[PDB]
């Protein structure tokens, strides 16, 4: 009833404390229905699961959705939903400020970290990251900080490994790009008329040619690159393709591929002392 | 084409092709090299440059003058009749626009232009 | 109607300054269309909000 | 368009004078030496001719040139109504100069010529030529209704084939 | 109109249409954008601008020259023949008025012009 | 090349009107007083003539000049279809101005002339002249295929004869 | 109206321009009928404040 | 904005925006660092600084000169056209005010300025 | 006036308006505020100031130079063209008067000026 | 390069390249030699010197003025367009920073600079 009565607004982030299969299935169905090109109302869900290491690993392996991110914690003095709310607030603010900046050192205010003997080691954190479970870290003082936020997506459709749809930054950037493209198209071209390429329309008429959409997409890509979201321009230009539909006669089909910029995560160093 | 040379140029802003007069200018964005001499000739020295597009538009056309004087973030496309195309992104209308006897001069300017197509 | 006022009538005509003190620290109701979030949670007894209503 | 301009000029001339002029008709060619004999002259009358065009300011417009030929009758060496002829010429100049007729803009009076020579005077005809010039823009080769609208813009982001697709089906209008 | 372009312009002061010559200018009031370069190209910078209307009036007309040289608070209307209209309020006569061979030049200026109608 | 330009102009004129014009043929010479009698006029029709050239911007190009002669029939002193003639002229001007035909670039409308005088009117023919001008570049005297490629570049450094030679056999391509 | 607005008496210009209507009278033939509506500017009367102390 | 640079600045005193000329200065309040050298270079040393705002006002404006020369406890707001704003509280008018050919120079000064908005 | 700014200034001594050149200065009498810093910024400090009027007079005019160099107790009136007026009473001619190429500089000074009218 | 001379210079603080104007100065840290004369000329004498970097930054840029006035321990990199690079470590912002008509002057100073790369 609650999921049916949400409405039609675009809730970009969702907090779900109930970590059970019957509820998460409905949430996944609704989110993947919204994620599709039909609804275009993007949404993300942030959850926190409290339990032993084995239970967290089993849950992370079991779930294979690219729209839900869960952070595992063991021996937490506070209830899980408080951590979920704080993490969702911090992540929402940070991603709204910039969709491409990694979530590497942001701290959670007012959340007590677990005991010294209940914190995961390096191997446990690495295995959790390989198992689709996000991990946190404890500051030099008593502060708890985000370590890396990743989604539950682990496996390709045929069963192979897939690094796509892994970082939350990828989903945020894709949503921002879709929103920006929609806004640009609906603003620059409110209501136009479609004509085939090579036709002689001349000055004055308000018609649109696939070359016009090509140029507008190139300009929008330049704006995206200057904003710090995409890196390579020549490849994007060479992979662009704009054409009309031979059946609808009112629908323009475009196939583009962006090169999402990389994030600075690992700094490997080797020191060769002489003494 | 095989022997075709540039005779006319087309300028398109946000997809609308502009009613441009004869003699449209275009200055690519790059590095302007100067000359250095002391006791002898030593070399050159660089200086940044900004892309410029210049043309004239008749008055009373489909595009009003108030729209022209309010262009801050637009896309300008300069295409020659032979097929050479240059794209200017996030361009703006510079200098003073004047309507002198039905002639409106545009000094559409941008900070970088790349040759697409 | 962004700020919820208490004990201050909405129909006041005396030209002056009206100052009120309230302990609760409310948050400005400025619309944020790009930062809309939703939260799921349980409500105990003595609740005044209808269930399944945002 | 030229037909609209010609119709507008003819209508303006007709409403300017009305019953004063016997007829107001278009003309083929500018004027020849045999026109005084091959035409149905009913003085006073006004003839309109289109004397070609010229290079316009753009490639979508041309500078058209028009001419008015007022015809008057002289009897026994004297014009029938000299003040009438002068008033007709002045009113024709003042009713067309600066006004817009159809798509044409700002008719400009180039010059007024006196065409009374042996050929016209020996036939008892007084002829004056009033020449104008305006701005006639060219039409478009392709009409809007032939082509259809741009309503839908569907974009698919490139990804490996066996991955959940990311796409946007955007309605350009509404 | 459908294809009509601007061929002539009409200028009216306090309701009296001025006997203007060919080639009447009009500069809208707005922001003039300059160009900024240091080690690279960075952007533009603004500067306020004032509305200007320029024309020429034959001598000996209904409106005397003493009236022209005494305009401090007047209303100036610039209308194109196609239908575009701009209104200048609280305008004034600027620069030096001269009667050169029956030609009087007007530099009617105002601090703000808006496009009415 | 001029033949390509003429063919392109003729094809464009044919596809612009199609069944409206009775014929579209090239013409020899510009126009003479005996052309109205020696030609197979089928009004309405369009004739294309090449009126020489001029000095171009370079030594590899010249400014060609072309002309279109639309022919229409007048019956009993009146044109058969005056709006049709006007539409034909306007469409011819608007379908050629600014477009590129073959190697020619940017046809420019110079002027439009009214050629209806005693000679043409007495034969019941209405004639208008539309003149264009473009940029036709000259071909090359020597074709590429006559000469062969530059594949090998062998260089020997000068040294005393009875010394180990130093040389470089460079393949220009690959 | 521009002078009035600059003097600090009226606020909105676009609405005033869109509501203007000037026409002649079809009976008097010497009387011009105009119907205009100005938007008289508001006055600062009530200042409502709420203080949320933390102590 | 995206590429907008500062072209003009606005100065407002007690809510009244000042008719300022071109070239308005602004010195933030902070610490001025000096240079220390003895036998070698050792470091820097601090010194307090006071906020300053400088501009020019035409004569005969709405705000009289007697009002200008009597500002002891006022609020000064310095805002750039791009959107950067600085607030000066309990400021005062320093130095000698002079009316030189219709130009009045203001040296509005304060002991601390913070960047609001 | 409504938008009129100060373009010229008039100086009148004992009722005789002076033939003044362009760029006439005026410094009102008041308090000059300085700046005080020790370990921090503390505030300002006052200092009395005297009214000054500066201008230039062409030589050979109605008022002789001997009269100019003998002004000990005069009334000086500084009026802007817009309507702002300042009165200086019991003023005197200060500094060295010089006739440099037909230019005589006046440094008319007084101990107090109030804005009348 | 082979004949390339220095035309522009780039200044980078903590990795952020500064929007610098034309004419950026650079004084290396070293020994300043003076001149010694008594009854004859004897030689020179040394004096320590500190590295200095000077430039101008437009107002309203990505880097705020409050950030500029708070630089105590930063890394400054001065690179010429030809390829010469100098590194300044533990630098600081010296002198008085002023925003004069959209121009902010930086006097970034350090106690030692070495030529890297």
Residue numbers in the entry:
A (entry chain c): 221 to 495
B (entry chain H), E (entry chain G), H (entry chain B), I (entry chain A), J (entry chain C): 2 to 118
C (entry chain c): 2 to 55
D (entry chain 2), F (entry chain 3): 1 to 174
G (entry chain b): 441 to 495
Recite the paper's sentences:
Myophage Mu is a representative of contractile nanomachines with a simple tail baseplate. It has the capacity to infect a range of intestinal bacteria and has extensive applications in genetic engineering research. Using cryo-EM, we resolved the three-dimensional (3D) structures of the G(+) type phage Mu in both its extended state and urea-induced contracted state, the latter lacking the baseplate, at near-atomic resolutions. The structure of extended Mu can be divided into four distinct regions: the DNA-containing head, the connector complex, the tail, and the baseplate.
